[PDB]
Amino acid sequence: NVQFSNQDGALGEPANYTQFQHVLTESELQISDAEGKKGNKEYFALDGNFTGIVNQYFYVDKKSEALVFKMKNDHLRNEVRVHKNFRTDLPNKLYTLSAEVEIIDPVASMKNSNSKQNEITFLQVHNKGLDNQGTHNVPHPLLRVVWKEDANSVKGHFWAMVKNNAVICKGSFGKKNKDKEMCKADVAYKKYDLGKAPLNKATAFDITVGNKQLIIDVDGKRLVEHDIDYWRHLLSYFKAGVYNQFTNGMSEAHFNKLEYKALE
Amino acid sequence: NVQFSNQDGALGEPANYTQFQHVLTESELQISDAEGKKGNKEYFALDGNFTGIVNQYFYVDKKSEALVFKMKNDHLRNEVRVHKNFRTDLPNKLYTLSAEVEIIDPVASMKNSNSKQNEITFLQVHNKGLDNQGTHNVPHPLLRVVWKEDANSVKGHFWAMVKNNAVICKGSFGKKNKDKEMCKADVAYKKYDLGKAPLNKATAFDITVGNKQLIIDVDGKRLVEHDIDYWRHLLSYFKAGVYNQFTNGMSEAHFNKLEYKALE
């Protein structure tokens, strides 16, 4: 049901913008049908060919040349997914996602939200599983970089939400773990305050995974340096865009820059 | 109702024999009620205190001073279980189980066996799981060292059955995997012929786990040297005794030597 159109030239087509071409070649698009049903998502450019992949939710702004990701409704998404499923535990192999991002009027996006979370996730490190096929996938990402509306009265900061073990804590395969100490919100996740999100300007994020480390630089400052030995068996991958943890509004993220690099 | 008895002195008590004291202090006993239900098991000596733990199934033969393990019925068990749940992937930590074992008249144990397997497992490396609590236990041991009746016309040989991935292939948590290629018998397992099992003679087994390697010496000859990078996340442990994969018989193994050694 996802439809593609540049609105007769109103919207720039991402594959035609040189600064995004290489990360698109390395990725596919995973995007919800915004008129569709909760949780739905569809995959495009499975081979990294983004020719003609553009619409009102995924496009390059012709004036700013920002790569724009939008999506509406709770738990729908719109994300570039870098194909490499990499090991996170090897000393000679480091994988880096570099973005400059501005979240556009996030307060308005959430003005009608009935969610207790009220987050926009715009960068992720997820796990594929034990192998490239997703065997024993853990349904929790290693990392969500979010814009969070209100974290105990701290308004509008970026946060890194870090899964701090490899334990399935929800769903069909978490029934035995759900109520254990390991699956408590305070144990299963480590939260890093990445500072106030500014309006009208971009913030640089550099996420480096490998050598049993999750590293995050924010505007060039090292804010996360987290050992992930516990994650060593899980092949992992990058996503960037938007994924909604709020109800009844439209999220909007502008990427001035989005690059992927593997150092082996 | 697992009961203990030295049969008024007919049977030597294992805790009183110096060559076995240390391995017992580091272990517990996991033993079926031989009159009990399929798959049953009870635990004793949880603190490594084997005083008073002896019966017709688990005792020291007074004349040979052989540590004897016996058990009857398919998939009933009688094993010592070393308590250390160790990492297998670290270069500076090696864990060794050293045994000298004779399988007593195994052909007669399996006289009336209706099993396609017809094995006696007497040494295992199993996994606890991600943690010391058994989270996400994989219900497949890394290693079973077995006496096998007939392996494609090869009779009475010792074998190392090595689980060759970390995939759950059976039970409630294996439904999604059990029919996939990774779970096929000749994919999930690597089988090492460890040579003919001699009668009336003991055989030396030295199993070393650590540094991403599973190593097995038989009579001082290096017959298994298996990379176990795939297992790196699974805390693992040693078992020795008898575990029956054959029907309507009594297994019996005699351990002249049983030592556990951690080199950290």
What's A119's domain CATH number? 2.60.120.200
Is B42 inside any structural domain?
Answer: yes
Query: Which residues is B217 bridged to in the sheet?
Result: B206, B222
Experimental method: X-ray
Return d(Cα B264, Cα B93) in angstroms, integer.
4
Q: ∠A5-A8-A13 over CA atoms, to 5°?
A: 55
Task: Tokens for A263, please give them.
Answer: 């150092």
**Residue A130 and residue B168: Cβ atoms within 8 Å?**
no
- With an 8 Å Cβ cutoff, the interface of chain B facing chain A consists of 89, 130-131, 133, 135-136, 165-168, 173, 177, 180, 182, 230, 232-233
> In chain B, how many domains are there?
1
| DSSP alpha helix (H) spans, chain A | 18-25, 106-109, 185-188
Return d(Cα A101, Cα A240) in angstroms, integer.
10
Rounded to 10 degrees, the C-alpha dihedral A68/A99/A75/A62 comes to 0
DSSP characters over B23-53:
HHHTEEEEE--TTS-TT--EEE-TTS--TT-
Resolution of the structure, angstroms: 2.1
Q: In the 8-state DSSP scheme, what is residue A133?
A: T
Our CA-based measurement puts residue A3 at a distance from the nearest CA of chain B, in whole angstroms, of 33
Our CA-based measurement puts residue B225 at a distance from the nearest CA of chain A, in whole angstroms, of 21
Return d(Cα B12, Cα B24) in angstroms, integer.
15
Q: ∠A183-A184-A186 over CA atoms, to 5°?
A: 125
**Residue B130 and residue A177: Cβ atoms within 8 Å?**
no
Identify the residue whose tokens are 């008898």.
Answer: B242
Collapsed DSSP state (helix, strand, coil) of residue B107: helix
Which residue numbers in chain A precede an interruption (C–N > 2.5 Å)?
Answer: none
Return d(Cα A44, Cα A80) in angstroms, integer.
10
Return d(Cα A49, Cα A58) in angstroms, integer.
15
**Contact partners, residue A148, CB within 8 Å, separation at least 6:** A118, A119, A154, A156, A157, A158, A159
Is A238 inside any structural domain?
Answer: yes
DSSP characters over A11-70:
SB-GGG-HHHHHHHHTEEEEE--TTS-TT--EEE-TTS--TT--BTTEEE-TTT--EEEE
Query: Nearest CB to A167: which of B89, B135, B166?
Result: B135
Return d(Cα B110, Cα B150) in angstroms, integer.
11
List of chain B residues whose C-beta atoms are within 8 Å of the C-beta of residue A177: 135
- With an 8 Å Cβ cutoff, the interface of chain A facing chain B consists of 89, 130-131, 135-136, 165-168, 173, 177, 180, 182, 230, 232-233
Collapsed DSSP state (helix, strand, coil) of residue B99: strand
Return d(Cα B245, Cα B106) in angstroms, integer.
12
Nearest to A45 by CA among A65, A28, A69, A64: A28
List of chain B residues whose C-beta atoms are within 8 Å of the C-beta of residue A230: 130
Nearest to A40 by CA among A10, A5, A71, A68: A71
Is B1 inside any structural domain?
Answer: no
Handedness of CA B101, B102, B104, B109 (dihedral sign): positive
Percent helix, strand and coil across chain A, each to the nearest 5 = 10, 45, 45
CB neighbourhood size of A56 (10 A): 15
Return d(Cα A49, Cα A20) in angstroms, integer.
12
Nearest to B224 by CA among B159, B165, B167, B166: B159
Chain B residue with minimum CA distance to A180: B135
Query: Nearest CB to A233: which of B131, B166, B177?
Result: B166
Collapsed DSSP state (helix, strand, coil) of residue A73: coil
Is A1 inside any structural domain?
Answer: no
**Residue B135 and residue A89: Cβ atoms within 8 Å?**
no
Return d(Cα A101, Cα A241) in angstroms, integer.
9
Is A62 inside any structural domain?
Answer: yes
Is A2 inside any structural domain?
Answer: no
Q: Which domain holds residue B259?
A: 7-263
Beta strands in chain B (DSSP E): 27-31, 42-44, 58-60, 67-72, 77-82, 94-103, 119-129, 143-151, 154-163, 189-196, 203-210, 213-218, 221-227, 235-245, 250-263
Collapsed DSSP state (helix, strand, coil) of residue A3: coil
Return d(Cα B161, Cα B206) in angstroms, integer.
15
**Residue B165 and residue A233: Cβ atoms within 8 Å?**
no
CB neighbourhood size of B208 (10 A): 19
Identify the residue whose tokens are 């049983």.
Answer: B258
Our CA-based measurement puts residue A38 at a distance from the nearest CA of chain B, in whole angstroms, of 24
